[PDB]
Design a protein around this ligand. Structure first.
Ligand SMILES: CN[C@@H]1[C@H](O)[C@H](NC)[C@H]2O[C@@]3(O)C(=O)C[C@@H](C)O[C@H]3O[C@@H]2[C@H]1O
Ligand SMILES: [K+]
Ligand SMILES: [K+]
Ligand SMILES: [K+]
Ligand SMILES: [K+]
Ligand SMILES: [K+]
Ligand SMILES: [Mg+2]
Ligand SMILES: [Mg+2]
Ligand SMILES: [Mg+2]
Ligand SMILES: [Mg+2]
Lengths: 85, 131, 63, 96, 163
RNA sequence: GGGAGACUUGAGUGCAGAAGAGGAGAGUGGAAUUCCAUGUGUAGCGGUGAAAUGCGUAGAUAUAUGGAGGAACACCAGUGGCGAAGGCGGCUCUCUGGUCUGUAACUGACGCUGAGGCUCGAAAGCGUGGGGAGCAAACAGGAUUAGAUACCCUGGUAGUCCACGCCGUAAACGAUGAGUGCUAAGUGUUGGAGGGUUUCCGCCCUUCAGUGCUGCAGCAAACGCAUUAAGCACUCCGCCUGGGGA
């Protein structure tokens, strides 16, 4: 849902109008990952959609690594907010 | 993804020279400008001009062809590469085609030709050969 | 001549049996887009509409 | 929401009263399961291109409806239309 | 182009190959001869000639080589600078050598260089040894050779400024 | 290289659009084969290079009308489209992935490759339970032949289909790893974008991304490749070192 995406972006935006940033992208990626995990658990055999999920997971991990390298405090804060490891 | 802009610059010159294109354009950098001016003052190129943009600047090179449209620049080669950096001590500075060519070298005194480098009695990184 | 473009219609309802009948040959077989002069995009839309019409009985499958 | 168009064929023999009852029953089905019927109509009465369920004739009735994609109104309508004998064949298509 | 006339040309038979064409009856033997004709002063060329007889094949090759004469830059007793010439599988490397070192080359390359007049040079064939291809590769390298004066004129600098 | 900053072109997000046999789930449509029932009808039908086996007076084949069931989706269909690969072709709906073109609001190098690992992976095959029309290893019979454990013919089980789980191999091929940039053109085609006309259609021009064909420079042992390089360059990975043994 684009409306769900927009509200998530507003919540996690570093400032007003910041559509693209590690935190925003990671938050949006995490919500899509959770929704797509539900989809996969529903359809074990949708292997192509699962590949898309894995691409999202890899991209999210790369963004998290960059954020951890750049600002560890923001990294800690973001993982706390999103309930990540 | 580009990993050696200097090597890409040399390749652009070689390809344009092969097709006898009049000029070529490359994204600009301090090292690229040093190389371009060395070629300029060595006579391997007709002229160099710099264009200012918002990204990184653009450097334009005018290829030099003699009478009968002969290519002055026979070829160019990248010596020191990201995969394997190359450094030479003062007595190791090479001569390209027994001096007919040149070897662009970066030293503590800046990017200079092999002739100047061995006149100063200093080594450095052998960026490229040209002849 | 691309009839769809000439008529200037962007939506192809599968109910317009009159419209579909000019894209199916006798016996109900669909016509090549090269034969009919129609474009690729319009051809795909016509194919879907004709198949749906066949299913709903607006057009005959064979003969 | 997502727009659906539903064209279904009622058998030629049905009485007008029975046809009205059938149409009203299915309209109630759509509304209760969550679909908002923006329009319903009897499109036409046409001879079938081929015999269907032993009939050469039918009454094509259209129902333009709108509903959320997740809502199961369309699914329940399809199940009930298959069950019913008065309707011969139904087609549901998303419309832009 | 180089005019063969006015040049005191001399020839050397690099190789004579016995080549066969299979015909309905059997074999049809011919001789293919590779020859190098040079002037011992910087002009050299190579030619090929096919004929039923060795002398005729050599004569044809010599005429062809005269038509294909080329000139090679030479500094002192050696070539100006190192050069590698490739033609097909052939691949020859040549470097200048100090005075008196001789012509350190093998077979066909010796003929080409000696005929061209070079006296002190080092060589190595890093590719195939097929005589025709190595001779062709040799001349490619010799053409690649460049003169200090021409290079200086091209670059617009004096020869001293170049060196 | 390290550290401290700055930047937006690479990268990604946002916003606006585009096409698609991309995938998974549940339904559904007609053609056709086989079988079943019942009519009409009488001696063959079927098959081969030629024959025979086989089916048929217990009425076959054919023919009309129905009914059953399984599998695949004619026309469209196109060096067309989508997919990382295998692969994906009736139609409808639900869930879902990716790609492409605009804009330049957003972060400011966050990228490329990627041993070891994990996932997918045609067909055949294995396990469990169903399904089974057609086709068909094995097998039976008839032919052919010197022989015929085959090719041909008549039947025909597993299998081919479905659900879950193994298997992880193919000439899994473009017999061409991935990323990036640069280097004549000509001509088709797919999806966009912009403009100049055009009443609209359309025509013409520009440009981005695919897909083909021809063809410079260059490359190549040759065949040929040639902006979809096998050309010119850089980064990372996989792999090769005579044939057989293997
Ligand atoms: C039928 N006559 C043949 C025929 O003319 C052949 N040429 C095609 C011919 O060829 C030959 O001349 C040949 O050259 C080969 C030789 C075996 O036989 C020769 O005689 C050959 C003659 O006998
Ligand atoms: K029904
Ligand atoms: K989609
Ligand atoms: K099985
Ligand atoms: K394949
Ligand atoms: K061995
Ligand atoms: Mg299988
Ligand atoms: Mg058989
Ligand atoms: Mg293998
Ligand atoms: Mg293209």
């Amino acid at each position: 849902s684009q409306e769900r995406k927009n509200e998530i972006i507003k919540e996690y935006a570093r400032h007003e109008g910041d559509t693209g940033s590690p935190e925003v992208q990671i938050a949006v990626l995490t919500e899509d990952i959770n929704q797509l995990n539900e989809h996969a658990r529903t359809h074990k055999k949708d292997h192509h959609s699962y590949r898309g999920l894995m691409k999202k997971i890899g991209h999210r991990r790369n963004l998290l690594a960059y954020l951890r390298k750049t600002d560890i405090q923001r990294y800690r804060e973001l993982i706390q907010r999103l309930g990540l490891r | 993804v580009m990993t050696d802009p200097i090597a890409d610059f040399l390749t652009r010159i070689r390809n344009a020279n092969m097709v006898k294109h009049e000029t070529l354009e490359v994204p600009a950098s301090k090292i690229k400008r040093d190389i371009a001016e060395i070629l300029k003052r060595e006579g391997f190129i007709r002229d160099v001009e710099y264009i200012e943009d918002d990204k990184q600047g653009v450097i334009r090179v005018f290829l030099k062809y003699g009478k009968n449209e002969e290519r002055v620049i026979t070829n160019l080669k990248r010596i020191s590469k990201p995969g394997l950096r190359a450094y030479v001590k003062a007595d190791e500075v090479p001569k390209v085609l027994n001096g007919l060519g040149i070897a662009i070298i970066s030293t503590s005194e800046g990017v200079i030709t092999d002739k100047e480098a061995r006149a100063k009695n200093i080594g450095g990184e052998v960026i490229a050969y040209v002849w | 001549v691309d009839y769809i473009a000439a008529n200037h219609i962007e939506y192809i309802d599968y109910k317009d049996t009159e419209l579909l009948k000019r894209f199916i040959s006798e016996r109900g077989k669909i016509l090549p887009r090269r034969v009919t002069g129609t474009g690729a995009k319009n051809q795909r839309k016509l194919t879907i509409a004709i198949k749906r019409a066949r299913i709903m009985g607006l057009l005959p499958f064979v003969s | 929401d997502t727009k659906y168009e539903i064209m279904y064929i009622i058998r030629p023999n049905i009485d007008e009263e029975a046809k009205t009852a059938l149409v009203e029953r299915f309209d109630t089905i759509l509304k209760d399961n969550g679909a908002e019927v923006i329009e319903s109509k009897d499109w036409e009465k046409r001879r079938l291109a081929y015999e269907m369920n032993g009939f050469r004739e039918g009454i094509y009735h259209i129902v333009n409806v709108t509903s959320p994609s997740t809502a199961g109104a369309i699914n329940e309508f399809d199940r009930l239309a298959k069950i019913n004998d008065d309707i011969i064949r139904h087609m549901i298509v998303k419309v832009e | 182009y180089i005019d063969p006339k006015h040049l005191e040309l001399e020839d050397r038979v690099v190789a004579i190959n016995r080549v066969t064409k299979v015909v309905k009856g059997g074999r049809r033997l011919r001789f293919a001869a590779l020859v190098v004709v040079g002037d011992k002063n910087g002009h050299v060329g190579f030619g090929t000639g096919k004929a039923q007889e060795v002398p005729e094949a050599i004569r044809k090759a010599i005429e062809d080589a005269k038509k294909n004469l080329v000139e090679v830059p030479m500094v002192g007793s050696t070539i100006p600078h190192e050069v590698i010439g490739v033609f097909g599988g052939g691949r020859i490397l040549m470097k200048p050598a100090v005075e008196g070192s001789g012509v350190a080359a093998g077979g066909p390359v010796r003929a080409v260089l000696e005929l061209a007049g070079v006296a002190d040079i080092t060589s190595k064939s890093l590719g195939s040894n097929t005589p025709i291809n190595v001779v062709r590769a040799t001349v490619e390298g010799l053409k690649q050779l460049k003169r200090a004066e021409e290079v200086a004129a091209l670059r617009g600098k004096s020869v001293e400024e170049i060196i």
